[PDB]
Amino acid sequence: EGREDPQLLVRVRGGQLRGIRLKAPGGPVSAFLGIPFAEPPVGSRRFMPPEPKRPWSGVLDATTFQNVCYQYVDTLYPGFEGTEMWNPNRELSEDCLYLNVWTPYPRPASPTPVLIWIYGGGFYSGAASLDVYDGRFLAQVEGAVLVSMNYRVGTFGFLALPGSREAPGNVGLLDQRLALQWVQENIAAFGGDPMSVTLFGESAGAASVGMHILSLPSRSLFHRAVLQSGTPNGPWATVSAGEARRRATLLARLVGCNDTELIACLRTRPAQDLVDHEWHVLPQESIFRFSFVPVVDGDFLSDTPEALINTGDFQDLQVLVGVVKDEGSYFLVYGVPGFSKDNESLISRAQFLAGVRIGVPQASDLAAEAVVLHYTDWLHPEDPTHLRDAMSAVVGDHNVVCPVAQLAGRLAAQGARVYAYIFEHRASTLTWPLWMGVPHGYEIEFIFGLPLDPSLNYTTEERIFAQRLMKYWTNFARTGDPNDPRDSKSPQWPPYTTAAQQYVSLNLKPLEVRRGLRAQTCAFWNRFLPKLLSA
Amino acid sequence: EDPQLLVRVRGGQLRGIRLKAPGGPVSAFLGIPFAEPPVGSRRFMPPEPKRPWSGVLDATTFQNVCYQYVDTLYPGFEGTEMWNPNRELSEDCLYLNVWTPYPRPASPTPVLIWIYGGGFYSGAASLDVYDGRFLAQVEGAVLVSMNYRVGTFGFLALPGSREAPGNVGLLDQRLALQWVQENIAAFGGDPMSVTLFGESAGAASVGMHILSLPSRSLFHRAVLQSGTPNGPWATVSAGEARRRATLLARLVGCNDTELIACLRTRPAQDLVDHEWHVLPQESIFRFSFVPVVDGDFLSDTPEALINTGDFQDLQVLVGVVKDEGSYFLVYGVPGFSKDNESLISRAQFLAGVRIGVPQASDLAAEAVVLHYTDWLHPEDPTHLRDAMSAVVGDHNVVCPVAQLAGRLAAQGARVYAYIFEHRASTLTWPLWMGVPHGYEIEFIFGLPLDPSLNYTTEERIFAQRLMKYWTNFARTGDPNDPRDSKSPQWPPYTTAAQQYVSLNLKPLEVRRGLRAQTCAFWNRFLPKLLSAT
Numbered sequence A: 001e002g003r004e005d006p007q008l009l010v011r012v013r014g015g016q017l018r019g020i021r022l023k024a025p026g027g028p029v030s031a032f033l034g035i036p037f038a039e040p041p042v043g044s045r046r047f048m049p050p051e052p053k054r055p056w057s058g059v060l061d062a063t064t065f066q067n068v069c070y071q072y073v074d075t076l077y078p079g080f081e082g083t084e085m086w087n088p089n090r091e092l093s094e095d096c097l098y099l100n101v102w103t104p105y106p107r108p109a110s111p112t113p114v115l116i117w118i119y120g121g122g123f124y125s126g127a128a129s130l131d132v133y134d135g136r137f138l139a140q141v142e143g144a145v146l147v148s149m150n151y152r153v154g155t156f157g158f159l160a161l162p163g164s165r166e167a168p169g170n171v172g173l174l175d176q177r178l179a180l181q182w183v184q185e186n187i188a189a190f191g192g193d194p195m196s197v198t199l200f201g202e203s204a205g206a207a208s209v210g211m212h213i214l215s216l217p218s219r220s221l222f223h224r225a226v227l228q229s230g231t232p233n234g235p236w237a238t239v240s241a242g243e244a245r246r247r248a249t250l251l252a253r254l255v256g257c258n259d260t261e262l263i264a265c266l267r268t269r270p271a272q273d274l275v276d277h278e279w280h281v282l283p284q285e286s287i288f289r290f291s292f293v294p295v296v297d298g299d300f301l302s303d304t305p306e307a308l309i310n311t312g313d314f315q316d317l318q319v320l321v322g323v324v325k326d327e328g329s330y331f332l333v334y335g336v337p338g339f340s341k342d343n344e345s346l347i348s349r350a351q352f353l354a355g356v357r358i359g360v361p362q363a364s365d366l367a368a369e370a371v372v373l374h375y376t377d378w379l380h381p382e383d384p385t386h387l388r389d390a391m392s393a394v395v396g397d398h399n400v401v402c403p404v405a406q407l408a409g410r411l412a413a414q415g416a417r418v419y420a421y422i423f424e425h426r427a428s429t430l431t432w433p434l435w436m437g438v439p440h441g442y443e444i445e446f447i448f449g450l451p452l453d454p455s456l457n458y459t460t461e462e463r464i465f466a467q468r469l470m471k472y473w474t475n476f477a478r479t480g481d482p483n484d485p486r487d488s489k490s491p492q493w494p495p496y497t498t499a500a501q502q503y504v505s506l507n508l509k510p511l512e513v514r515r516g517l518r519a520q521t522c523a524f525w526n527r528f529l530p531k532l533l534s535a
Numbered sequence B: 001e002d003p004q005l006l007v008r009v010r011g012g013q014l015r016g017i018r019l020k021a022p023g024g025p026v027s028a029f030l031g032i033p034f035a036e037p038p039v040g041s042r043r044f045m046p047p048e049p050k051r052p053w054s055g056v057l058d059a060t061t062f063q064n065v066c067y068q069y070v071d072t073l074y075p076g077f078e079g080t081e082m083w084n085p086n087r088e089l090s091e092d093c094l095y096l097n098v099w100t101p102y103p104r105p106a107s108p109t110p111v112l113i114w115i116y117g118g119g120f121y122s123g124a125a126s127l128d129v130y131d132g133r134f135l136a137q138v139e140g141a142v143l144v145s146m147n148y149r150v151g152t153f154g155f156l157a158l159p160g161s162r163e164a165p166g167n168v169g170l171l172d173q174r175l176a177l178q179w180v181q182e183n184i185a186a187f188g189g190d191p192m193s194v195t196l197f198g199e200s201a202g203a204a205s206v207g208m209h210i211l212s213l214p215s216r217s218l219f220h221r222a223v224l225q226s227g228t229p230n231g232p233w234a235t236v237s238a239g240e241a242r243r244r245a246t247l248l249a250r251l252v253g254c255n256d257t258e259l260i261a262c263l264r265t266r267p268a269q270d271l272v273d274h275e276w277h278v279l280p281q282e283s284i285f286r287f288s289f290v291p292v293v294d295g296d297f298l299s300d301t302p303e304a305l306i307n308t309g310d311f312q313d314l315q316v317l318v319g320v321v322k323d324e325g326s327y328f329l330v331y332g333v334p335g336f337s338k339d340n341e342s343l344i345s346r347a348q349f350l351a352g353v354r355i356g357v358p359q360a361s362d363l364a365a366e367a368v369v370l371h372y373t374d375w376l377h378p379e380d381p382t383h384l385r386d387a388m389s390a391v392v393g394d395h396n397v398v399c400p401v402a403q404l405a406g407r408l409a410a411q412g413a414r415v416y417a418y419i420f421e422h423r424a425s426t427l428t429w430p431l432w433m434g435v436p437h438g439y440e441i442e443f444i445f446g447l448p449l450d451p452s453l454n455y456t457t458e459e460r461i462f463a464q465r466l467m468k469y470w471t472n473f474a475r476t477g478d479p480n481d482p483r484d485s486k487s488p489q490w491p492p493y494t495t496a497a498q499q500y501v502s503l504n505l506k507p508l509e510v511r512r513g514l515r516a517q518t519c520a521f522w523n524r525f526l527p528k529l530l531s532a533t
């Protein structure tokens, strides 16, 4: 080895790694980036569960992010930061089963609570290498060991011919699980405490985190979970075995393809091809629906997440869950007619009713009418600003907020310690229009402490706010309690309970406790709407 | 023989009585017959005009209350008693009362015709709360009120039959209205300015006159307090009236002619004994014999008629009370009583909803329950009780009022809406019922002006406000004082703004949206949910 920095040389089960000393505002961090945790899921291994990475010889260079899993690249607004920031920042490859570790520099003397990030991207995109997921700040400032993994998204991660051997489904979850296993086995080499592993993830990452809560083999792999603006339950996070079967076969047809023959044919298809066609398998014109998502395979998910959260026992579990003020807004611009990032997206009543069909694609006419009935401000049913916002709300509520309420409820009710938040601070640097409020994904950069980077132009209040949030998150990672055990002058973040339904606002202001997470409306989505589908 | 108390009406001479109202005399002409007593073969039959009489008809005491069920739920309780018959029950009850100022107006003064409520099963124009002396005295109103047949006698219909064609209680009303047209001038009342007002079934009745062409020429303005021709209780279909009439007949031991003929042979209390027993479900705020959509008096359902009606030159004042629904809960909704605080369980709430929305399928009932649960405190009994109140008032009054308000406004009516939020200090019902329906009536009628009644002085001032609104409305079609300013003004209810005022001790506050969200649920969604089960 010779002349390299002794702190960047770590051994893991698969061999030797050279990480990189990264600058964070407050000092250096060790980053080990692109550590393989799986055999490349290429060729015959596409759609297949991940196989653990075979040891390598010599010192693996872990100084750069590895490939991003093959995925649809958003080109709605080319060159626009608001979309770009989420797009692959590394080469797209199916050989993308890599993970990243950030640790204090020098690496912590004593075992440090590990935060594992699981990115979102609706299960068709994402990458642990995105700037918003930069673990350097949590590592430097909070002394956290932060792990993020790439997991296969899209067909590659989720195309399922349920029952088959060649495409069992949920393999992207299995990638994730494999990275969790990797952390259990290897994190101590970094000063990470495998006995204090907190999964956190946003959106599909949050759904993913929830699936891990819901899937035994994952349960031993982490101790606490943060679910940001996503849940395993809800209308998008999973598909039935039947529907996954439907979509896999359809995608097969779309690309020119007994499961084995079909999958074999899919495995001959070049990655871009699967990507090019994956959008085209969705049953309706929808937003917040993704083609290849966790399949309720009876295996990874032994039953629907709804069933599993309704009957699961979560004694041991501390969960931090929450939402942004405007979960729906982001989605509207991706094909709800009338919505745009470039204008105030004031919509008509017709455009609202139309958006409701798209936003609640599984809704019957009655259901959709209920939604419209429920979200219409009957004092100004025609008011386009209201309609625009209720459209946001419908989509936000239906996909995130109410799933999260449902999740926080069922979890609390079944033993888990649940801390619920709503994140309400619109980043000063947001490039999405004002009307979009705090769209989802836009708390991430705060949790991750990007605002601490002076070069990023965040306000001072945001830097402080990020520090608070990192404190909450890492306090939660350390203890199962977001609350600063030191400073008790600060207002307390009370558990969320079915009885009290307490959750906190996360904004520039001190923690304000609020009760009932959109309680009225979520009763509509979580209790009433299902029944409206039983008839 | 006070000459002020002598009136020649079309059917002959009447002697009223001089009554004292706190600020002066009023001429009261009480018990004027406007119809042949609808007795014997005339039971269930359209009222015939009262034949002329000889000499001087003593119109100094209230006449008989139409034969009706007397409420025995809380015997001796002012809260229930004040609605009970305060005169002999008789089928011979087709009498109206006229209060005028004393001396009687020099010039044609606007007429208020009060139509009492009582679910179409009860009421009397003679109840102390319908005392017309105040409005007569303070406001120079010629106040008219009629008895109309309630229960089987007014509303037992075998639709299409010649001898129980239904809506006769309404025809009774229509006849009193015609009587006013023909006769009110003789009292100094202005037949060209007749404002119908009524509360609850009386409001529904006013509503029905609005919706019935023959009635339209008999009044110019309408005030529907806490009731509407539309909504779940004010009407039944022909088939349902037929069903209940034939069921009632079965229950009393009885081809239309023969069935009706048999029913006609039955003592009045026998019909009333079995009146209750014909409701299709265990309900509250549902009444056995109510106006029937007959394609005659009501050419279509009130729903249909308010949707399509043309109301250009109509002024309507509608409103509700804060707690439209509370009163009704004690009458069959388990867990509710005027005595305890009626803190109900969730279970009792769910059960109460099937009773309160008796027409609700399971799903619809769940929708109601889901809607009215405060999911933040889903089992809190105060909330559930209040929600049960709300469920009932909304389903039954507030939302039908909102629907009517909106449909009338849209269809060109001039509409003023109110919510009445002042609980009478003298209210014998418990606090949790807040302002139950009916309990604005005493205020509108001016009862707090009678110092003997123990209303606070604020209530007297308020009743004076209320009487001004009602009579201004009577006078002008606009409840606003063309004397006052910045008061604020009571704005018309419109479908756009949805402005309505709070009638309470505090000055008018304009509000927007008469339970708009919840009424959208009741008026827009519930129907879809039922018309798809």
Ligand SMILES: O/N=C/c1cccc[n+]1CCCCCCC[n+]1ccccc1/C=N/O
Pocket (backbone or CB within 6 Å): A072, A074, A086, A121, A122, A124, A278, A279, A329, A330, A331, A332, A334, A440, A441
């Ligand atoms: O695989 N799908 C390809 C495709 C093709 C044609 C049109 C649409 N799609 C889906 C992309 C949906 C975009 C949904 C939102 C994208 N997004 C990315 C990162 C962070 C946030 C978001 C949006 N949140 O609302």
Ligand SMILES: O/N=C/c1cccc[n+]1CCCCCCC[n+]1ccccc1/C=N/O
Pocket (backbone or CB within 6 Å): B069, B071, B083, B084, B118, B119, B121, B122, B151, B272, B275, B276, B288, B326, B327, B328, B329, B331, B438
């Ligand atoms: O027609 N027979 C009816 C009957 C017979 C035997 C037992 C019970 N009932 C119904 C009771 C009245 C319905 C409740 C309305 C009571 N009420 C009367 C006057 C003024 C107001 C009210 C209550 N409003 O909520």
